[PDB]
Amino acid sequence: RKTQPYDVYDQVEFDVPIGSRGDCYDRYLCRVEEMRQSIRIISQCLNKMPPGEI
Amino acid sequence: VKQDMPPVGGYGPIDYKRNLPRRGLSGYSMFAVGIGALLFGYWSMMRWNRERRRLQIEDFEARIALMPLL
């Protein structure tokens, strides 16, 4: 969603969690941070919905 | 037209950050509380054990008095 983005993912702003050790703990923390950033993108999409067709 | 849209001023704030309030006491406080509890327990145990030793001595001398008839 940052390197080869699609339709309107280039118009939102979010962070990408990065691990350090490769263990299950760092990846669980990465998943939780991805939940936080998903909430951020959800708020940004709620506040920026354009009118038109479907 | 009528569609699902956000209002003019947008919606309210939405949180996305980790919130850990760090509630509790410092280590010195809990360690001092534990040491004080230990000292209070030790003092109470010393008093009750001395009293129990005196009671045991009294019962033993009662048996000493009762021994020859038996």
If we measure between CA atoms, which residue out of B24, B55, B17 comes closest to residue A17? B17
Nominal resolution (angstroms): 3.5
Cβ contact, residue pair B16, A39, below 8 Å: yes
* Residue given tokens 């941070």 in the structure block: A33
Beta carbons of A46 and B11 less than 8 angstroms apart: yes
SS (H, E, C) A31-44: HHHHHHHHHHHHHH
Q: How was this structure determined?
A: cryo-EM
CB of B16 within 8 Å of a chain A CB? The answer is yes
Residues in chain A: 54
Q: With b meaning 16 or more CB within 10 Å and e meaning fewer, what string describes B37-50?
A: eeeeeeeeeeeeee
* Tokens encoding A35: 């939940």
Residue type, B25: L
Of all residues in chain B, the one with the smallest CA distance to A40 is B16
Residue type, B68: P
Distance from the Cα of A34 to chain B's closest Cα (Å) equals 10
CA distance B47 to B39: 13
- CB within 8 Å of A42: residues ≥ 6 apart: B14
Cβ contact, residue pair B11, A47, below 8 Å: yes
Three-state secondary structure call for residue A13:
coil
Query: For residue B2, is it left (φ>0), alpha (ψ between -120 and 50) or beta?
Result: beta
- CB within 8 Å of B15: residues ≥ 6 apart: A39
CB of A39 within 8 Å of a chain B CB? The answer is yes
CB of A47 within 8 Å of a chain B CB? The answer is yes
